[PDB]
Amino acid sequence: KTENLDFRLSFNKIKVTTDQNHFSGGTSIEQLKQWFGDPNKSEQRNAGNITLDSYTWVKDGAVINAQLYKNSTVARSISNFSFSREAKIGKEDYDELKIGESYKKIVEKLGEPDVLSQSMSSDKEEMQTVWSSGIKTKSSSATIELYFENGLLKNKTQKDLE
DSSP states (O other): OOTTHHHHHHHTTOOOOOOTTTOOSSOOHHHHHHHHOSOSEEEEEEETTEEEEEEEEEETTEEEEEEEETTEEEEEEEESOOOOOOOOBOHHHHHHOOTTOBHHHHHHHHOOOSEEEEEEOSSOEEEEEEEOSSBOSSOTTOEEEEEEETTEEEEEEEESOO
């Protein structure tokens, strides 16, 4: 049984805009508050004439952040969370991951990463993902971290798996 599971799963409801022209259609603050209640912290992040509204929620040490441009999410992250789940990912599954492989395909194969951070700009989208559970190996401490660009695998790393 995974503690804090609902907080993690609600994180999947947060959508980063895919509109590289005008950044529309990302999750709004009204939606975030429906799911998570009032944020623990918020701040306006200014750079030149671009302003993002950054909001952070904390629950049992897990931290969710969302950054919104004109009330549309452009970046999101969760930290300090792990699932309690069956060990299914082995060294062979890791070895099979190929540069250019889609995030969608990889989640079908490995299950959802424990934590991730995702952002976009008009030029590119990126995502960093960590699996800290669901790994079948000698060491209890094993992790897999995958970097994605534009929805596709760009780099893979592992600790204590092979």
